[PDB]
Amino acid sequence: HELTENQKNRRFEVSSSLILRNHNEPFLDRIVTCDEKWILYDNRHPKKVMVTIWWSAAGLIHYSFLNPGETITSEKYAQEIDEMNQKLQRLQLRKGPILLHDNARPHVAQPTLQKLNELGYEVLPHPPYSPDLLPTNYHVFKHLNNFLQGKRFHNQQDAENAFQEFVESQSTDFYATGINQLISRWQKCVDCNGSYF
């Protein structure tokens, strides 16, 4: 993607504001974050399965694979947020969670917005065209790409089993790395006047 001037401005504005917010009142520890990815069956039309992973600095919260019958809708994403939140509630056994996710249509439509309001989630400002500011993408997915190269799955189950081994392979500090990098990435974005860095 070739950033326009308005897109760089939005990146710069959000970056600068988030760095100051965290300095004023640190909130990284309250972030829950996610993203969707298509996992190809052949990693050397083509079969693929979509995964959604949810996590915080404390660790893996929830992940799910899009199954036959299911549609990628705001209705589905709302049900996923409810399930994720139940798992977070078990795992956290005090300030409310803050969701960082991109502007994919289901993320920003009803009834996703109402679900977030009902469960007590703030949504973090996120600028368009910025996977370099989305930790699931710049951290988890980067390491997952490394892991999948260059495997071959036969079915959806083998693809799931490889994602599982990937997740279970990670050390306890792996997630914290991705989250904590946000400060440095916001700053690099400010340093480059809202461009990529």
Binding site: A57, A58, L60, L91, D173, Y175
Partner: peptide, 4 residues
């Protein structure tokens, strides 16, 4: 800390 991190998840149990």
């Amino acid at each position: 800390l991190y998840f149990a």
